[PDB]
Symmetry: C2
Subunit: 142 residues, 2 copies
């Protein structure tokens, strides 16, 4: 059956978001176990994080096979070119809108160090966008 417009389409999206966060969280936690001398705990966090990678990738497989869009950008991700276009769209949103906006709010609320971080990130995502744009030119132009 067609997944478009179903609740299952939404649940694959929110499964993807949670899986993505779980992998990042567990690898961040592992580095604390590392410094404190808990190699078995760190190893378990790393191995379970591989599980969450598998989960996230499986959600994306169903999304792509179903003709659903990228959770992050609402752009198709069927072909490699589409995947690069999805990357460009996300990076563009981040540098032109999201991170500058976060920076302005941080400065206005009295958090200059957080604002500086968001402005670093905006410059980083702009750099990423440019790099991906150069890939798209290669792919689209053969």
């Amino acid at each position: 059956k067609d997944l478009k417009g179903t609740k299952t389409a939404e649940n694959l999206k929110q499964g993807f978001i949670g899986e993505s966060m779980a992998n990042r969280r567990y690898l961040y936690f592992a580095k604390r176990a590392d410094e404190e001398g808990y190699p078995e705990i760190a190893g378990l966090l790393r191995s379970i994080a591989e599980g969450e990678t598998a989960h996230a990738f499986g959600h994306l497989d169903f999304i792509r096979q179903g003709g659903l869009t990228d959770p992050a950008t609402d752009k198709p991700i069927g072909t490699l070119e589409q995947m690069i276009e999805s990357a460009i769209a996300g990076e563009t949103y981040e540098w032109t809108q999201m991170y500058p906006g976060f920076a302005k709010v941080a400065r206005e609320e009295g958090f200059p160090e957080v604002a500086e971080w968001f402005e670093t990130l905006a410059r980083a995502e702009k750099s990423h966008a440019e790099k991906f744009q150069n890939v798209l030119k290669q792919l689209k132009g053969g």
Copy 2:
């Protein structure tokens, strides 16, 4: 200045949203890299994997500001200051997933006529239950000394 209280601020909400987006970016770019791999684009795949390391650094930095600002884990709304608290956050999210989120997703998938997706969600419910048990075993290690 790193320990300024962020509770209640719009900046707290923005750090959480930034962490979500960074998390997804790393997963997406490593997924895309595998498509570039099979098709024979190693420079594209390598760029995707290197940019993914950037998004790891971003995500981890967001987590640093979240913890230092006295904020909670974006995924679980639990404190993640100490290692013990980090494992308790892992257990809380695993518990939500196996007791509620994935079983509910599987029921809706079956109702909507997606039995293959339902089977996948059921597999994941069992997986997150196994993860919860293994983290519970570790926590008992930490608290026992």
